[PDB]
Amino acid sequence: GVQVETISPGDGRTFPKRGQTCVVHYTGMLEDGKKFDSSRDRNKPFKFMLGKQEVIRGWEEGVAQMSVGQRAKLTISPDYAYGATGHPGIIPPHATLVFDVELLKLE
Amino acid sequence: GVQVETISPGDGRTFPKRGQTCVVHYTGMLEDGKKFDSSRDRNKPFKFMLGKQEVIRGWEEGVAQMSVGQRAKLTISPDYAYGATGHPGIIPPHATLVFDVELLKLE
Ligand SMILES: CC1(C)COC(=O)CCCCCCCCCCCOC(=O)[C@@H]2CCCCN2C(=O)C1=O
Numbered sequence: 001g002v003q004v005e006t007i008s009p010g011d012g013r014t015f016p017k018r019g020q021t022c023v024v025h026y027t028g029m030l031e032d033g034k035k036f037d038s039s040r041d042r043n044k045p046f047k048f049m050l051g052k053q054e055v056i057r058g059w060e061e062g063v064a065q066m067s068v069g070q071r072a073k074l075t076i077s078p079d080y081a082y083g084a085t086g087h088p089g090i091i092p093p094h095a096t097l098v099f100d101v102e103l104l105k106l107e
Numbered sequence: 108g109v110q111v112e113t114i115s116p117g118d119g120r121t122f123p124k125r126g127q128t129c130v131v132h133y134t135g136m137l138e139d140g141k142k143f144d145s146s147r148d149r150n151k152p153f154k155f156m157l158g159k160q161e162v163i164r165g166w167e168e169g170v171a172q173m174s175v176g177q178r179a180k181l182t183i184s185p186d187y188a189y190g191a192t193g194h195p196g197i198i199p200p201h202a203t204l205v206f207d208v209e210l211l212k213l214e
């Protein structure tokens with residue numbers, strides 16, 4: 001499923017609600033440590049609307065467990081990520097993905 | 108034959124030679140992405156001697172054209188795999204096989 005593991009505590013009070021835009025910085029890597037992308041390298045935070053289902057299930061369910069200001073490591077099994085397909089040219093088939101996510105703010 | 112499609116490049120200069128032990132991680136799938144075996148799943152690299160014929164011909168010709176650190180998707184026709192006999196209870200007769208292979212190192 002998605003396992004969430006705190007790197008830095010957030011405020012423990014403001015959790016995203018469905019319909020809110022989460023603003024995050026992230027780095028994603030394959031289970032073996034090979035990194036495949038980071039918004040920090042573009043220094044452009046990534047934004048998505050929770051509930052809209054435009055990101056993988058592991059992100060929808062993992063980020064909803066986070067409060068503003070938290071930095072956490074989410075390790076996402078293949079069924080909550082890209083499955084047998086992968087993401088062409090970046091993610092291989094059946095890959096467990098590990099993401100370091102920081103929830104900057106809600107909009 | 109075997110088609111090699113690269114997921115991530117290796118050095119493009121250290122290719123395996125006859126008699127060397129190739130150390131790889133792999134996932135074996137039928138064309139629909141259904142996984143029938145994976146070394147990753149038992150967390151043990153697979154090792155074989157290039158030129159010994161102990162692995163199907165698509166693996167001997169496919170991995171000979173990979174360089175260290177490369178991860179590639181090999182699509183193997185049945186005549187380079189198990190032909191009409193298949194592999195009892197896992198692979199059907201005349202099945203095209205897809206393997207995700209990462210050449211981790213040479214010994
Ligand atoms: C796509 C992928 C492989 C690679 O992403 C990029 O190379 C650039 C991202 C630029 C922003 C557009 C992304 C649109 C989101 C929809 C793609 C689904 O992606 C995901 O769910 C996760 C989590 C959010 C970051 C992207 N994401 C990922 O799995 C990734 O990191």
Ligand SMILES: CC1(C)COC(=O)CCCCCCCCCCCOC(=O)[C@@H]2CCCCN2C(=O)C1=O
Nearest residue numbers: 133135143144145153161162163164166194197198
């Ligand atoms: C056998 C099969 C269905 C199942 O394989 C295993 O269960 C591997 C067990 C671990 C190693 C045992 C020694 C296997 C020696 C090689 C046997 C022939 O297999 C093959 O050529 C291909 C390619 C290499 C991985 C095994 N391979 C395959 O076609 C497979 O994945």
